[PDB]
Amino acid sequence: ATKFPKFSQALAQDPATRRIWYGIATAHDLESHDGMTEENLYQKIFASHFGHLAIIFLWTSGNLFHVAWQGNFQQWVLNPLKVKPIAHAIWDPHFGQSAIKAFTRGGVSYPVNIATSGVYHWWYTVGMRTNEDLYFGALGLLVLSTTLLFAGWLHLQPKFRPGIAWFKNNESRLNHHLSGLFGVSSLAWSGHLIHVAIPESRGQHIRWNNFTSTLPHPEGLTPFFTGNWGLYAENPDTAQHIFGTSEGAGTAILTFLGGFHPQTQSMWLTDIAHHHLAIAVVFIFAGHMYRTNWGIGHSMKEILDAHVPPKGRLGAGHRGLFETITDSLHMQLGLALASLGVATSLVAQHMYALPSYAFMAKDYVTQAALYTHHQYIAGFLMVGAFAHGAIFFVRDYDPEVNKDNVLARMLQHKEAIISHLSWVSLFLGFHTLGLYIHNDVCVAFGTPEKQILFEPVFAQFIQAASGKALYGFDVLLSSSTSAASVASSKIWLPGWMEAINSGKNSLFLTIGPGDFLVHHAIALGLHTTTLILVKGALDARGSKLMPDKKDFGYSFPCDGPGRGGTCDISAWDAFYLAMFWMLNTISWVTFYWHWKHLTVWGGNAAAFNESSTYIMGWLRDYLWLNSSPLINGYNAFGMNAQAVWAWMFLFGHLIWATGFMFLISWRGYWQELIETLVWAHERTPIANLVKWRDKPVALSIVQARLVGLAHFTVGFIFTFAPFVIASTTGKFA
């Protein structure tokens, strides 16, 4: 009715404060709202997609506008290695005088924040040189956000709402996505690179007024049409190019030298355009696959129904998977989040391994922040994929449709899967903790020579097979006169070998026993998080303790204290438990990356190689040592520009600590406390005339777990980000 949860009649009649909390918390759960049909659900999701896309482009336009208005892009272009990039200007009426002088840094004269997101290098590579270019990009993205908001409004109109058959058109949507949204966009980016970014790297000034009359190549469409495509690769940029200017430059637009530009320590811009062109052609061909309207093409139902091994090896094969995926939005979303989590972990690895933006791998602060950023986001997406698979099992899985399916057999032998994940996790934890404690006791007792240090020969063999030639394995690419080393010897090999065998890059960092131990720790974390998530997903439909768990839904508090006790029995509680393990393993990964790069950037990799084998070495050489510039941001003798990072460090500590409130103390204590406070307010004079509308009650059990988990996570992020930024900023190496 007129009450706030208009979508839930059950919540609107709640006389307590639980109504507001649950109405806020269940606003986006479009499947369970009152009187919801499938078509209306799909239309609302389409409109929400448009609104979210507009939010993304508004955020990017805001970044562009703030760098254009309050930034030092003009000064940073002229000297990228010595000028600090600027995020935006600071307005604070709470500042003292010394805070105003302390935050006044860079070339500007106002208090200011130094950008650690690397947007300066990215825009500098793609041809931005002035503040007007950034402002025009901000205007374009503002107009795009306006257009997307209008489109979202338009597709909820009665004559423009698409039908349910339009949404479930898998072949047409995948054809158009794979061809257009991937290949045509990659082709357009290759065109932008060749027309603007490559000439800007060579000193030419190409903008909207002269791009249509300036030839990107001296010949121009003659090597392409005649078939002499190798003319575009001749005369590349020499190894004296000096980015942004024209001395030692070339006239090539599509090359595959491989390796790094010698000055910017990033990949060649002509390699990237060639890469994008190849990906464009491949994606257009791949989008030419599924039957839409012209006879040719596949049917996705027939491919899935055909793939049955001959004699019952996988049951009934993939029969019925087409009907389950199309009719369940939770399975599609789970597949999307799993793939996106793999993708953003891949970008996290490859942007430090193979930097593409000019004059990165020398800032080190953007280099740390981007990696930690993308790894934490990867962990979040990975947990969400399994959470939505559990939701799909709870309220979207049809057992009769999936009879003897490849999906039902997963539930058939779920006990074997959970038990073997248990065995792997227990084995890894036992052994890597035993090795770490052994090294701790051996170093503590004055005998570091008694440590168990396993040399990581498999990954070192992989590095040698990629071309690294200090391990002395002499195999494949590391050994000349080999088939792999000869076949590519005149396309991309010399640049790759001169980039992999130098000590200034992050390509295939030299690894020792500490790398072995911490990789085993990472495998432990991955296997245990997978254990919790897979067990929750597979036991979401029921177990021995609760055979009818599907009747109670995905998220419910418990099943009472009977038959032993049923605390944390739902699949939502399995998500809640696996969130801690994801945070733990991402913290392990980021600690390993940050300490290894802190020792490599300072030219002191021996410190990591000697102190990473035992836990006290970590504790006293990474965390205790690198906190000194952070915690000294403000003290009894004054303050500097890292005072905000010290304050945020303590802030994240306090939020992480007050999560333990909701995680350890449970409802009953607080409900009785609330009842005493209710008596207090009702029975005091003057103040009893002020009467509440909603009866105050304690937070519910699932709500309390969510609030404590959100506190734990926010405190986790807000205590790791200031450390990983200020410790790198406080050392410059």
Binding site: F4, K6, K44, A47, S48, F50, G51, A54, L58, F65, A68, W69, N131, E132, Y135, A138, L139, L142, V143, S145, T146, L149, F150, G152, W153, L156
Partner: peptide
């Protein structure tokens, strides 16, 4: 250097985007 007229033009575009955002949010409605 970004002039004041350019900033006010960007503010006008953002205001139009705000009115359309209100329209979309009230088309999904509560």
């Amino acid at each position: 250097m970004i002039t004041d007229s350019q900033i006010f033009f960007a503010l006008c575009i953002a205001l139009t985007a705000a009115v359309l955002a209100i329209g979309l949010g009230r088309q999904l409605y509560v």
